[PDB]
Every structure is written in structure tokens, then in C-alpha cells.
Amino acid sequence: MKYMITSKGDEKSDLLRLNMIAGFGEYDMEYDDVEPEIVISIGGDGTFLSAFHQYEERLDEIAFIGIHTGHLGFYADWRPAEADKLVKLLAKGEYQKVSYPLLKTTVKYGIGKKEATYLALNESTVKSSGGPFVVDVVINDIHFERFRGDGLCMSTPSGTTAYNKSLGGALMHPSIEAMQLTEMASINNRVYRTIGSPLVFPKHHVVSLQPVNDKDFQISVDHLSILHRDVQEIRYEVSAKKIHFARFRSFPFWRRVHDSFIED
Amino acid sequence: MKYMITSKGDEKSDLLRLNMIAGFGEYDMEYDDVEPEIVISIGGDGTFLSAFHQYEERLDEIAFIGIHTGHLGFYADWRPAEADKLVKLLAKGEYQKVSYPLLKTTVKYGIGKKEATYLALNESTVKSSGGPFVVDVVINDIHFERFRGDGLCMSTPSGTTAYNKSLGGALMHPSIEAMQLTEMASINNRVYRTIGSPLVFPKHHVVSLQPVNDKDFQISVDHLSILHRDVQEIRYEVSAKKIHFARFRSFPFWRRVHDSFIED
Amino acid sequence: MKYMITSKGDEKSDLLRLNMIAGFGEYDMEYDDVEPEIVISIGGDGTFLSAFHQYEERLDEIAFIGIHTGHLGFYADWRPAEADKLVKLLAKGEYQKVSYPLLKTTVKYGIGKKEATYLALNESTVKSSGGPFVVDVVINDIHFERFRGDGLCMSTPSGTTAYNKSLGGALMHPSIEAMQLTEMASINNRVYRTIGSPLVFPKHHVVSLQPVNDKDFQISVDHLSILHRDVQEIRYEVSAKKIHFARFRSFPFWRRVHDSFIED
Amino acid sequence: MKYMITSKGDEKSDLLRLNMIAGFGEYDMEYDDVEPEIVISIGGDGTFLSAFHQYEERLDEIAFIGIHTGHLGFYADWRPAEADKLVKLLAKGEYQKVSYPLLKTTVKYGIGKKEATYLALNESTVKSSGGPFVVDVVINDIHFERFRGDGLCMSTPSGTTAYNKSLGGALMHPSIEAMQLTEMASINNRVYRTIGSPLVFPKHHVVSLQPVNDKDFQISVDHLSILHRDVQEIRYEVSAKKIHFARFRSFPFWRRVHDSFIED
Ligand SMILES: Nc1ncnc2c1ncn2[C@@H]1O[C@H](CSSC[C@H]2O[C@@H](n3cnc4c(N)ncnc43)[C@H](O)[C@@H]2O)[C@@H](O)[C@H]1O
Ligand SMILES: Nc1ncnc2c1ncn2[C@@H]1O[C@H](CSSC[C@H]2O[C@@H](n3cnc4c(N)ncnc43)[C@H](O)[C@@H]2O)[C@@H](O)[C@H]1O
Ligand SMILES: Nc1ncnc2c1ncn2[C@@H]1O[C@H](CSSC[C@H]2O[C@@H](n3cnc4c(N)ncnc43)[C@H](O)[C@@H]2O)[C@@H](O)[C@H]1O
Ligand SMILES: Nc1ncnc2c1ncn2[C@@H]1O[C@H](CSSC[C@H]2O[C@@H](n3cnc4c(N)ncnc43)[C@H](O)[C@@H]2O)[C@@H](O)[C@H]1O
């Protein structure tokens, strides 16, 4: 099987990568970072996020695996001391695949424009180019609210433990095909009104943000953050595409949440 | 078709009920409150909740409809001025059914006990008999947290706009088969830790609350509130059963939320 | 100096108490639990709260000191291993007094009634006798809001780290003469509106709760919880009375908060 | 008395300004925008904020008054229809002054640097230059927390109804000499910990933010927002300076809050 390994790039991660490559050299098992079937990430969630975005045009063909050199691995699965066991198990094909939902973001411009389309594993957020942030929120073509505040965050299920959590969003099991919209510092008074609460949308629901003033927005997709000018619409929906993980052993999502927030 | 009508019991609702009965007398269309196929509720959500609990052993056989004499009808569908049109449409069978998920609550006791089982359309909550409230939260047999605070609330999707909302929970579209757990005044310090965030569980996930001290709890199921003694376990899961609504015309959930919280 | 010692009542606290009494026997320093000038509490904050309420008619004459046998001493000052040093320092009168604000609660009834008056070190809360909870909130005689929800909590500055904190209230330095009002699960929709936010009131401001329906309320004052019937008014204001602590050494409030919530 | 009038600059505000000037021409009462004793602002709170910052070196000599051409006047006092009555009352000197606390912000740099000092009527906030935001929070020289998240907001009492409110802060009566610190999207997990809660500081307490990485910050002071490079420290304290308002008639702060958030 073709595989590749991304590293965080510190001494620890590089040496671990070299050892795994040497270990894989005893099997079959070819290193290929153009068309890999397995992508191993060694580092933290940031490294894992970069690996995902490196290969987003090949998601249907790849199973991802993370080794964490932290603290903190929501997309790890593995400790560095377990790397030899992982080489062994991965070479023997002793694994069942697990899929998580992804978020599609479409950014439509004026003139042309595009139509830029992005895929997120954690979330996409929108803020002003600074700038009061004011947008009309449209759900399946019905005007829902005029949002005023700092910005909005649209999260995948696996993303709910990240930025979503800090904003008061719910944690959602990744078997649920949904996206969740949270507010950043909404303004609520006698004249300005928002829902307040996070909103959880099923597949096929479309959430559209339309400028009120002010057509310039800072848009993030996971780690990536870009200033978009002359925006006519930002559009969110659950992607038809999914990320596939290689597992290996039981490590339930709720235990992962327990280990990350309660105690380990 | 067999039908019945529950009324809130004020002059407005009773007279509306009598007129609808008279209107149904011109069709076929028999009044039967033992084995109805259609249950019409005239009042508010409280009246609707009582109608549901009146007929919870016949949920597979009944389509529910609500007329609101409020303000505030999340389970209405209809205004009193539209009652004649509703009589007409309901008699002609001009409707498609919509189903919403329900919550199963199991309360297990010591000695015997039971095993009391309840069905909720909005939510089930647990508080102490007063009493510090302390429970172990167990998700699919793994210990997740020791919760200390005022209590816990487990909501259906349609329930998310009710008690769940007041506690900071997410609003969830009712096409999603899930339940949501929210905290009431959790204690968080260096020694006591809870997740903080609401938690959204898919079908087949089981959330179990187990007493730490203190085996006496005040348990609510929608409007019903009962003191249970000598509790060994409280168990939550998405019910296999569903409530069926008769519709009639498009009134999307998100528009219902808009009309109820933003403006109408 | 006259002193007394309350104990939590477990083996640890009782023996510590006996040793301190023996230690005080070597000074002057008379044990008197009728008219003490120093009240030592050995246990947790619960023990300390009971000691305070034991002597609330003598607050102007007493300096309080807490030794914690926890984890968790917001009203401790002292570890059990330091008890000998404390005996020594307290006998020599090597201490400056620190005062914290208190909360006055007045409960007015119908017929008669009373006028029951309570003093709180942490907070007073109000909930329904169960029961939807609905009250009119009146600030300095102006109608501010109709509150619907689970209840309300009025906290002292030192109380802000307790129930207040769990409800989303601000932590306030105890040098500020104020009280803070927080909501429990407020209902907010198109027809029902509350402020949402915690409210911080200075000295001489009066907050009055007046029944809308329903004149029966469960009222807590620190650990004490009582069902009051036929209530006409519940009235809150910063007390003219203060609790005095004996200190001893610098242990700033913010460090106390750090040690209790961040790390120790 | 010397006075000046700032206008929002739309037709409505300019004409109102011209009429008030004409009205003041019948008294004594000289227009002077260099050394005014009365500053009238016609517009919204933004206009009022600009008027304040226009004259921040003369705060001890000026009484401010606002007329609102909104909706929304927390620093208005007056409707446009009342402008004639205001001209009359202001000319006769029929007013008592009211003072509100202000926030001092000190920004210290490396090399030199400065020491930039700012005065805020609403708040000062800090965010990264984008950028993960990580700062050490130091209260009166004791390390309190390492904050990770979007940013921090330090509010005056009158500022608590603004940005502070959106971030979950308490509303504080402006007779209380304090500042309030709120979090923007704090990260809390097993390894990263913040207090969560808003913090209310008395006069003479000093809150210092010290960079961990990353010495570049976007700092706001009311409407003003500036990118500061090579920051060594950001320092907050309640200013010795106060804003003085001219009043005129009773319009209590809590009624102002009611009118702005509940109903008018
Ligand atoms: N999925 C997930 N769950 C929990 N924690 C995560 C996750 N993904 C990344 N992280 C953690 O984010 C940290 C930096 S990853 S860089 C990009 C991510 O940063 C996250 N981010 C950005 N601002 C915030 C704030 N303010 N709060 C929480 N998370 C934030 C956002 O989700 C982005 O996708 C690091 O501690 C990771 O362990
Ligand atoms: N599904 C739904 N959404 C929104 N609002 C609802 C819903 N069901 C009922 N209600 C409203 O609850 C009010 C009384 S119904 S009696 C039983 C329900 O009360 C609700 N309850 C109890 N305490 C609270 C609090 N504290 N906050 C919000 N809701 C609460 C809970 O969901 C129970 O199921 C009335 O205004 C109804 O319009
Ligand atoms: N002042 C203060 N700060 C922090 N923690 C405190 C304080 N006073 C007591 N406690 C802690 O409350 C716990 C039980 S004391 S019994 C009475 C107090 O319970 C508190 N209480 C009741 N329900 C709650 C909830 N739901 N959350 C937080 N605190 C609560 C309330 O403040 C009462 O005054 C124990 O861990 C103490 O260390
Ligand atoms: N003091 C006060 N209370 C309530 N509302 C206020 C106040 N001052 C200004 N405003 C309102 O802020 C709006 C724009 S003023 S421009 C500068 C202020 O914007 C405020 N701001 C910036 N971002 C936010 C967010 N996200 N939420 C609330 N307020 C925000 C912040 O307090 C700044 O001082 C307008 O509706 C004013 O009526």
C-alpha cells in the first residue's frame, strides 16, 4: 500500500517519521506523497489539519491516521511509543475505516467571481475586514435574522470540540451528519435581535450569509484565513465528501472528549 | 375518520371546539376519544403536551394537530380564525404526515422496582429532592463525568426551543434523530469538573445517570414532575417511537423558530 | 480574649479542635461560645457558613477565622498543619481585621406577617414552590422586568465565586460594596423578555421581587432553605452589617480565586 | 457659558444643531469649540464617543449632553423634539452634574516606546494581529492565568451595556468605581485553563497583560482601533479622571437599561 508521512518538523516528529519509514521498509508498503492511500500525520491537530488540506482532492482514496507529540490529539489516535505497533498493524491491513462529515463553504463574488469553494474539517468562520460585522442569515431561502456582532462560526461534528466549544456550541457525535452555527459576541437590544443559541442543521439545509453594507469579509477555513473582497454571498452546507480514518482499536468519541476536557 | 378534540378549557377554546365538532358533523368524521386517528388540540403547547400524553400508547395510529389560542404555538400549526379551513382540509384528507423524534426515560429502583419508563416530547430533567445534586454520567457504559450542580436536562429536537434553550442548549432541526443533554448551574473548580457544553447524542447511544449519595430525585417528563425514591439508575435514549403531525401546508421549523423568537 | 471553635465533626476536625483548645490553655484566652470575640471554624466552607449564622447577632464583636480540612476553603485562610502557628499568632494579637459586605433579605407576607429578615454571606435565592416561577423585578421602585424561568440569585461579593459563578455571574472583589443578581434558566422569546445579563447593584439600591401569581416561594439564604407562603414581597439590599475576618498574613482575594479555580 | 455642538452630519442632525445655535444666540452663551464648558452631541452613541475623545484633555472643565437621532442613546438624555426645552434649561443653568468612571489603558513597548496612554468611556479590547492570541494575565503583580482565545475586553461601568454585555459580562451601576474584564472565546481543556467568568476590579487594582509569543496586538479604545507592534505590557486601571454629564431631570441608569433592552 502507498503511504506518506507529514511531520510537525521538530526533532521529535522528524526522527519518529524516519523510524516509521525504516519500519515500513520491511513490508510492502511504498512511500508515495503524490497518490498515497494512507496519510500519517505526526505532530498535533494543526499538523493533521495541514495533512487533510494537502490531500483534499483525494479524500475518497485516503485513510488518515494521527500520532500526537502533544498533549492534545483529537485527530490522534496514537502516542509516539506506539509507533512500532502502528507500523505493524498498518502493514497487515488490520483496520476498519471510520468516516466523519465535512463542511462545504461557497464564496460568491460580484463581477467575476467565482464561486470559491472550500472544504473544512473543523470549521469556517466569517468576520468583518474591520468593520462592524452585519449580515443577513438566510436558511433554505427564508430570511432568519439580521446578525450584528463579531462574526459567525460554522462547525462540523468533529469541529464542535474546537472553536465551536469556546463560543458556547454543543458537542455533537460525528456519526450525525450536520453542521452547527454559533455566534461571536452578538448584539441584542430593543432594536437588534439574534437567536442567541447555537443552531444545528441537517444535511441538505443551506445557510447563506448576505452582506448588508460592507461586502469585505475575513473568512477562515480551519487554519487558513483569507480576506475576500466584493462578496455577494457566503454559503454553507454539509459536504457530500467525508474524511476517512484508519482504526485499529476502539477509542470512542465520548472517551476522546473525556480524555481531552475532563481528565487523562 | 375518527377524531377527538382537547380544549384548554377557557371560553375561547371550548366554543372553538364546539364549532369544529359541528363542522365535522357535516362530514364523515366520527368523534371518538378512545381510539381516535386524529387528535386536535386547542390551547397552547401545554394543552398539546397533555393531548400527547393522553394518547402515548397509540402514537403509531394518531396524527396530531394544534390550534393556538396564544401567543406561542410551537406545536401549533393553526390560528383560531383558520379553524373552518382546517375542518374542511382534514375531512378531505388533504395532508402529508411529519414525524418528530421522542425521548425514552427509564428509571430503575432498588428492591423492586421497576423500571418505570416514560416518553417525552420536550424533555426529561433530573434534580435532587433538595439535596445537593451529584450524579455520575455514564455514556455507553464509559464513565464520562461526575456532575455536581442543580440538575440535568435531556431534550428532544423539538424540545430544544424550550427548557433546553434557556439552559444554553443548541436548537436542532427535528429531522435529526438525537437527544441533547444540558447542565443546570454546574460547579467547576480545581477539584470538580464537568464538560460545561451541551452534548448531542445520536440514536442508540445510551446516557445513564447513577447516584453518588443520595438516591432520591425529582424527575420531570414534560409537564409531569415526580419524586422518585431509592433510584439506582436513570437511563436516556432516543425512542424507537415517534410523534406524527398532520400537515397541510409548508411551515418550516426554522420559520417557526423565527416567528417565535425573532419577530412575527 | 474569649474564643470558640466549631468543628465539622469528623475525627480530623475534632482532634484539631481539641489540640487548639489545649494550645490556647497555655495563654489567656478563655473558651466562651456565648460571647466569643474570635470564632474559629474547622472544616469546609459549610462549617464556616454555620459558624457565621450561629453568631449573626454578634457580627460587630467577632473576628472569624477558618481552617480547611478540604480541599476548598474560600473562607479558610489556614491548613491543619499550621494550627499551632495560628494558636501562637492569635494569642499574641498579631492580626489586622478585614471586612466583607453582606446581603440583607426581607420577606414580607400577607395578613401577618412579617417581615422576616435574613443575612447572607454567600447568597439568597428564590425559586417557586414548584410551580412556574414568575416575578416582577422592581429596582428602586421602577418596574424593570417580568422574570420567568427557574429562579433568581442575589450574591454578595465573596459569594460571587459560589452559586453566582455557576449561573454565569461576574467575580467581584470584596472591597466593592455591592450585590449581584443572576438569572436561573430565563425564558426569552418574542413575548417574554428578561435582561439576560447579571446585574450589579451598589449600596442603597433596593431590588424587590413581587409575585405575579403564585405567592409561594422556596427561599434560600446560604445553606438554609425555607418554603415561604403568602409572600407579598422579597426585598434585597446591601446590609449595613459586615463580617470581620482576622488576618494574619497576605492572601489576596485574586490569589484565593487563582488557587481555587486555576491551580494550586 | 461657552459651548459647542458636534453633529452626526446627516440632514436631521445638522439642522437641529443650527436651530440650537440660533436658540443659544438669544442667551449668553458663546459658541467656542476650543475651550467649551458644555459639549452637546447630536447623533448616536458613536457621535457622543467622538465628542468625548475630541475633548479628553479638558474633561475636568466640561459637562457633556447627548441628543439622540436614533433609536439607541445610552449617552443621550434627549430626543430631538426636546431641543428647545434643552436650550432653555441649559441657558438658565438649571442642572446638577453626574460623573461616571473611566478606564486608563497604558501600552508599554520595547526599545522606545512609550508608554502610550489611552482613556476609554466604554472599553478597551485586545486581540492578536492574527495570530493565535496568548497572554499572561497579572493582577496586582500576581500571575493569575495564561489566557488563550480570541481576546479580552476591559469595560467601564457605563461600558457594561456595550461590548461587555455581548461577551456575557455583568451590567454595573456607574456609581461603582470599577472596571470589568471579559473573555472572548477562551480555550478551556485539560491543559489550558482560564477563569471563564467576568472579573470586576475596584479602583487601584492593576491588571497587566504580558505577551507570551507574539508581541503584536490589535488594541481598541472605544471606536479607535490600532495595531501596536513590539508590546511588552498592556496595563489597565480605573482612571483618576471622570466624565461629567449635565442633568436636568431624573433618568436613572436602570430605567435607561430597561428602555434600551426590555421595552420603550
Ligand atoms: N477538533 C478539535 N477539537 C479540539 N481541539 C482542537 C481541534 N482541532 C484543533 N484543536 C486545537 O486547536 C489548537 C490550535 S489548531 S490551529 C486551527 C484551529 O484553531 C481553532 N481555534 C481558533 N480560535 C479558537 C478559539 N478561540 N477557541 C478554540 N479554538 C480556536 C479552530 O478550531 C481552528 O480549526 C490546538 O490546541 C489544537 O489541539
Ligand atoms: N417545544 C417548545 N418550544 C418552545 N416553547 C415551548 C415548547 N413547549 C412548550 N413551550 C412553552 O413553555 C411554556 C409552558 S409549557 S409547561 C411544560 C414545559 O415548560 C418548559 N419549561 C420549564 N421550565 C422552563 C424554563 N426555565 N425555561 C424554558 N422552558 C421551561 C419545559 O420545556 C416543559 O416541557 C409556554 O410558554 C409554552 O409555549
Ligand atoms: N464563597 C464560596 N466560593 C466558592 N465556593 C464556595 C463558597 N462557599 C461555599 N462554597 C462551596 O460550596 C460547596 C457546598 S457549601 S453549602 C451552601 C452553598 O452551596 C452553594 N451552591 C448551591 N448550589 C450551587 C450550585 N449549583 N453551584 C455552585 N454553588 C452552589 C451556595 O453558594 C451555598 O451558599 C462546597 O464545595 C464549598 O466549598
Ligand atoms: N454604552 C453603550 N451601551 C450600549 N450600547 C452602546 C454603548 N455605546 C455604544 N453603544 C452602541 O454600539 C453601537 C456602535 S458604537 S461604535 C464603538 C462601540 O461599539 C461597541 N461594540 C463593538 N463590537 C461590539 C459587539 N460585538 N457587541 C456589542 N458592542 C460592540 C463597543 O462598545 C464600542 O465602544 C451602536 O448601536 C451604539 O448604540
How is residue D204 written as a grid cell? 487601584
- Enumerate the β-bridge partners of residue C128: C217
Chains touching chain D at 3 or more Cβ pairs under 8 angstroms?
A, C
Q: What chain B residue is nearest to C152 in terms of C-alpha separation?
A: B185
CB proximity list for B249: less than 8 A, separation 6 or greater: none
- Enumerate the β-bridge partners of residue C220: C125, C225
Strands B142-149 and B171-172, by their bridges, are unpaired
Technique used: X-ray
Closest ligand relative to D261 C-alpha: 4
Q: What is the CATH number of the domain that holds B256?
A: 3.40.50.10330
Q: What chain D residue is nearest to A169 in terms of C-alpha separation?
A: D185
Nearest to A107 by CA among A204, A238, A226: A226
Nearest to C231 by CA among C89, C136, C146: C136
Angle between helices D11-24 and D83-91 (to 10 degrees): 30
Cβ-based contacts of D252 with chain C (< 8 Å):
140, 142
Query: Could you give the C-alpha distances from A163 to A126, A159, D150, in angstroms and in order?
Result: 12, 7, 10
- Tell me whether B168 touches chain A (CB under 8 Å): yes
Nearest to C144 by CA among B35, B145, D263: D263
Catalytic annotation, pick one of B28, B32, B33, B45: B45
Q: Which residue from A166, A186, A187 is facing D187, i.e. has the nearest CB?
A: A166
State the distance between the two ends of chain D, measured CA to CA, in whole angstroms: 34
- Enumerate the β-bridge partners of residue C63: C38
Q: What is the DSSP letter of D244?
A: E
Q: How many residues does chain D have?
A: 264
CA of D153 to the centre of ligand 1 (A): 21
Q: What is the CATH number of the domain that holds D132?
A: 2.60.200.30
* A188 phi and psi angles, rounded to 5 deg: -130, 115
Q: Do D145 and C205 touch (CB under 8 A)?
A: no
Question: What is the count of structural domains for chain C?
Answer: 2
- Tell me whether A60 touches chain D (CB under 8 Å): no
* Residue B205 annotated as lining a ligand binding site: no
- Tell me whether A262 touches chain D (CB under 8 Å): yes
State the distance between the two ends of chain A, measured CA to CA, in whole angstroms: 34
Resolution to one decimal, Å: 1.9
Closest ligand relative to A121 C-alpha: 1
- Same-domain status, C61 and C140: no
Residue D7 DSSP SS3: strand
- Enumerate the β-bridge partners of residue D181: D154, D199
CA separation for the pair C146, C233 (Å, rounded): 14
How is residue A21 written as a grid cell? 519509514
Which residue bears the cell 488563550? D148
H or E element that contains D75: none
- Same-domain status, C255 and C172: no
How is residue B165 written as a grid cell? 434553550
- Same-domain status, D217 and D123: yes
DSSP secondary structure string, B61-101? T-EEEEEESSS--SS--B-GGGHHHHHHHHHTT--EEEEEE
Q: Which residue from D176, D255, D262 is facing C176, i.e. has the nearest CB?
A: D176
Tell me the nearest-neighbour CA distance from A217 into chain D, angstroms: 14
Residue C163 DSSP SS3: helix
Q: Do A171 and B198 touch (CB under 8 A)?
A: yes
Query: Measuring from atom 35 of ligand 2, which residue has the nearest CA?
Result: B45
Residue C151 DSSP SS3: strand
Binding site residue list of C: 45-46, 122-123, 148, 150, 158, 161-166, 223
H or E element that contains B235: strand B231-247
Ligand 3 atom closest to the Cα of residue C122 is 34
Q: What is the DSSP letter of B193?
A: -
Closest ligand relative to C187 C-alpha: 2
Q: From the CB of B185, is ligand 2 less than 6 Å away? A: no
- Do the Cβ atoms of D171 and D160 come closer than 8 Å? yes
- The Cβ of residue D114 has, within 10 Å, a number of other Cβ atoms equal to 14
- Same-domain status, C246 and C236: no
Q: Which residue from B184, B191, B263 is facing C185, i.e. has the nearest CB?
A: B184
Q: Which residue from C193, C202, C257 is facing D173, i.e. has the nearest CB?
A: C202
CB proximity list for D130: less than 8 A, separation 6 or greater: A225, D218
- Same-domain status, C9 and C118: no
Tell me the nearest-neighbour CA distance from D185 into chain A, angstroms: 5
CA separation for the pair D69, D71 (Å, rounded): 7
* CA–CA–CA angle C257, C261, C264 (5° rounding): 85
Domain residues for the domain of C195 are: 102-240
- Same-domain status, D202 and D109: yes
CA separation for the pair C33, B21 (Å, rounded): 75
* Residue A84 annotated as lining a ligand binding site: no
- Same-domain status, B57 and B143: no
Nearest to D189 by CA among B187, C171, C167, A71: A71
DSSP secondary structure string, C22-37? HHHTTSS-EE-SSS-S
Which residue bears the cell 473558651? C31
CA separation for the pair B11, D80 (Å, rounded): 47
- Same-domain status, B56 and B20: yes
CA quadruple C78, C83, C89, C90: dihedral, nearest 10: 90
Q: How far is CA A86 from the centre of its chain?
A: 24
- Do the Cβ atoms of C232 and C110 come closer than 8 Å? yes
- Same-domain status, B117 and B53: no
Residues 182-211 in C contacting B (C-alpha not used; CB under 8 Å): 184-191
Q: Which amino acid is at A191?
A: V
CA separation for the pair B142, A234 (Å, rounded): 40
CA separation for the pair A255, A259 (Å, rounded): 6
Nearest to B198 by CA among B178, B220, B168, B177: B168
- The Cβ of residue A127 has, within 10 Å, a number of other Cβ atoms equal to 20
CA of D180 to the centre of ligand 4 (A): 16
- Same-domain status, D23 and D79: yes
CA separation for the pair D202, C53 (Å, rounded): 28
- Enumerate the β-bridge partners of residue A126: A152, A219
CB proximity list for D111: less than 8 A, separation 6 or greater: D230
- The Cβ of residue C59 has, within 10 Å, a number of other Cβ atoms equal to 18
Nearest to C197 by CA among C188, C189, C209: C188
How is residue D65 written as a grid cell? 449632553
- Same-domain status, C119 and C186: yes
- Tell me whether A138 touches chain B (CB under 8 Å): no
Side-chain-side CA neighbours of B6 within 13 Å: the count stands at 24
Query: Could you give the C-alpha distances from A9 to A18, A22, A50, in angstroms and in order?
Result: 12, 18, 13
- Same-domain status, C63 and C106: no
CA separation for the pair A141, B250 (Å, rounded): 13
CA separation for the pair C86, C94 (Å, rounded): 10
Q: Do C193 and D139 touch (CB under 8 A)?
A: no
Helix H, strand E, coil C: the string for chain A is CEEEEEECCCHHHHHHHHHHHHHHCCCCCEECCCCCCEEEEEECHHHHHHHHHHCHHHCCCCEEEEEECCCCCCCCCECHHHHHHHHHHHHCCCCEEEEEEEEEEEEEECCCCCEEEEEECCEEEEEECCCCEEEEEEECCEEEEEEEECEEEEECCHHHHCHHHHCCCCEECCCCCEEEEEEECCCCCCCCCCCCCCEEEECCCCEEEEECCCCCEEEEECCEEEEECCEEEEEEEEEEEEEEEEECCCCCHHHHHHHHHCCC
DSSP secondary structure string, C189-227? SSS-----S-EEEETT--EEEEESS---EEEEETTEEEE
Q: Do D166 and A187 touch (CB under 8 A)?
A: yes
How is residue A49 written as a grid cell? 489539519
- Tell me whether D224 touches chain A (CB under 8 Å): no
CA separation for the pair A63, A49 (Å, rounded): 14
- Do the Cβ atoms of D198 and D172 come closer than 8 Å? no
- Tell me whether B258 touches chain A (CB under 8 Å): yes
